[PDB]
Design a protein around this ligand. Structure first.
Ligand SMILES: [Zn+2]
Length: 257
């Protein structure tokens, strides 16, 4: 029922999800001037060598690559985090044009897309319990700009036709998510929310400073997807991003000087 349409869009979500107007909503604009370096931030640790992708699916607002999270096969640690966070899925938000698509912005600068690697705190036993907690989730956010191709993206791009419409999934094994990372893991962090309903405020955001480059051909394959189910009138899956939300009380910290 909720979506990115003129009618069911971000501006109207509060109607069914009144936390949309809460104090810790994501995304936010990252003002480099006010976001200060914190030398007590530790570096990111990502152990992804045993990462086990299972499937890719079109859920009608994006596509999710899903991972076996029954063990610490693919985990995020350090940075601002206490304890171990298991990767459950990743997905993207993107725009209709290159000049937009990101959810977070940097001094109002919008990127072409934003990749989210979603992890959940093993303190709580499973994802379902984790989302009910303020320290429940860590999402690694990675900006996309258009330019050079991303080799490690191509495995994903190359299946997208097989899941064009809402409802469709396909097997997707032996995908390595290290292949979606940039060279520097310098980051900004701040407490926030899910950017889609139910918009729970359960996320330590970790937004990487260095964008990854992707090819024109790569982003266009994204834009070929459909929100609609098979048979319906075609609405292309584009502009599946939420605009910057009020920062309110919160401080954004930088891992770098
Ligand atoms: Zn997301």
């Amino acid at each position: 029922h909720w979506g990115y349409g003129k009618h069911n869009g971000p501006e109207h979500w509060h109607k069914d999800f009144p936390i949309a107007k809460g104090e810790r909503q994501s995304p936010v604009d990252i003002d480099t001037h006010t976001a200060k370096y914190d030398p007590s931030l530790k570096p990111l640790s990502v152990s992804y060598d045993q990462a086990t992708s299972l499937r890719i699916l079109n859920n009608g607002h994006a596509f999710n690559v899903e991972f076996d999270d029954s063990q610490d096969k693919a985990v995020l640690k350090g940075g601002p985090l206490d304890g171990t966070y298991r990767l459950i899925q990743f997905h993207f938000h993107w725009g209709s044009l290159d000049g937009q698509g990101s959810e977070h912005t940097v001094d109002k600068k919008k990127y072409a897309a934003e990749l989210h690697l979603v992890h959940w705190n093993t303190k709580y036993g499973d994802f379902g319990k984790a989302v009910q907690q303020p320290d429940g989730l860590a999402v690694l956010g990675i900006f996309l700009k258009v330019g050079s191709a991303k080799p490690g993206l191509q495995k994903v791009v190359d299946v997208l036709d097989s899941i064009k419409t809402k409802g469709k999934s396909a097997d997707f094994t032996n995908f390595d998510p290290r292949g979606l990372l940039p060279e520097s893991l310098d980051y900004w962090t701040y407490p926030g929310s899910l950017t889609t309903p139910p918009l729970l405020e359960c996320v330590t955001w970790i937004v990487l400073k260095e964008p990854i480059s992707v090819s024109s051909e790569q982003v266009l394959k994204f834009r070929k997807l459909n929100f609609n189910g098979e048979g319906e009138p075609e609405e292309l899956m584009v502009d599946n991003w939420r605009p910057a939300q009020p920062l309110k009380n919160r401080q954004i910290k930088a891992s770098f000087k």
